[PDB]
Amino acid sequence: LRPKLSEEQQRIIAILLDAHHKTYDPTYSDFCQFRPPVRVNDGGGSVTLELSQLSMLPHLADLVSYSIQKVIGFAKMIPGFRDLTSEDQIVLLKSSAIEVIMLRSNESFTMDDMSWTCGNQDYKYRVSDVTKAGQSLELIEPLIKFQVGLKKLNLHEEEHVLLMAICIVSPDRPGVQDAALIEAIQDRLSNTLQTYIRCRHPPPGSHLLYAKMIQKLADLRSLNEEHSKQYRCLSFQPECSMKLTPLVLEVFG
Numbered sequence: 001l002r003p004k005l006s007e008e009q010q011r012i013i014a015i016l017l018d019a020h021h022k023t024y025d026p027t028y029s030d031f032c033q034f035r036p037p038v039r040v041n042d043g044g045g046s047v048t049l050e051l052s053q054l055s056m057l058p059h060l061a062d063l064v065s066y067s068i069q070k071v072i073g074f075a076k077m078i079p080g081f082r083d084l085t086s087e088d089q090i091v092l093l094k095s096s097a098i099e100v101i102m103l104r105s106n107e108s109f110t111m112d113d114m115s116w117t118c119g120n121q122d123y124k125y126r127v128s129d130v131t132k133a134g135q136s137l138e139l140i141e142p143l144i145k146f147q148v149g150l151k152k153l154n155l156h157e158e159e160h161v162l163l164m165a166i167c168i169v170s171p172d173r174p175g176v177q178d179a180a181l182i183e184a185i186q187d188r189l190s191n192t193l194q195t196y197i198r199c200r201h202p203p204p205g206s207h208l209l210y211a212k213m214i215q216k217l218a219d220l221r222s223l224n225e226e227h228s229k230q231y232r233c234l235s236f237q238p239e240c241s242m243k244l245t246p247l248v249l250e251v252f253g
């Protein structure tokens with residue numbers, strides 16, 4: 001069976017596409033406003049040197065902080081999100097922030113050279129640039145594999161935005177009060193996605209794709225946990241707080 005998208009479902013997709021278009025600048029034109037990226041000579045991938053300098057942290061922390069703000073904006077536009085209490089809204093945002101950033105970054109990720117390309121060389125982020133931000137390969141390598149796998153799904157933008165929405169509105173986040181309401185909202189979203197794939201996504205991908213996308217959400221949980229572990233280590237570095245931002249400190253602290 002391939003039930004047609006209901007008027008409500010079509011409206012949901014429209015709202016999410018619009019929300020994404022208003023919160024994700026494909027030209028990355030604001031990036032020049034972030035603290036400048038600095039790339040020290042670390043061909044050896046020296047953890048000691050990376051931690052001593054954290055040369056790329058101010059820039060990437062600003063990029064992440066900026067992205068969290070955009071995600072907050074996107075989330076507020078998710079149909080039903082505002083029906084939740086502010087406490088639940090914040091619980092969901094803080095817990096999904098890094099995951100949505102990883103998902104949305106797939107738009108700048110390119111398999112041409114396995115980097116996040118957001119402009120000229122200055123705004124091209126490679127594994128080496130992330131390690132220069134004090135991040136561990138224990139996180140970055142799996143992150144890259146995740147990006148490639150997500151790339152290969154060749155998601156329509158409709159699927160991309162629905163996946164980010166579903167990621168955010170997850171009832172199984174620690175601290176949520178009204179898990180029931182959250183699940184109802186997510187189910188409305190998941191049903192839209194499943195319905196969209198079944199009647200709009202041409203094979204060989206008409207089906208099976210929903211399962212692959214849901215698996216990505218599971219992968220994201222592991223990446224989230226891995227990032228939290230690495231962020232903790234990074235936080236031990238003296239003077240690190242100044243290289244981050246208040247929003248970043250709050251979300252991951």
Ligand SMILES: C=C1/C(=C\C=C2/CCC[C@]3(C)[C@@H]([C@H](C)CCCC(C)(C)O)CC[C@@H]23)C[C@@H](O)C[C@@H]1O
Nearest residue numbers: 063064067101102104105108116125130135231248
């Ligand atoms: C942000 C966005 C972009 C890229 C994402 C990247 C590339 C650089 C390194 C990042 C920011 C990863 C880092 C492991 C996260 C480190 C954060 C912290 C220093 C606080 O522990 C996660 C996603 C990666 C650019 C654009 O796609 C908008 C998107 O929204």
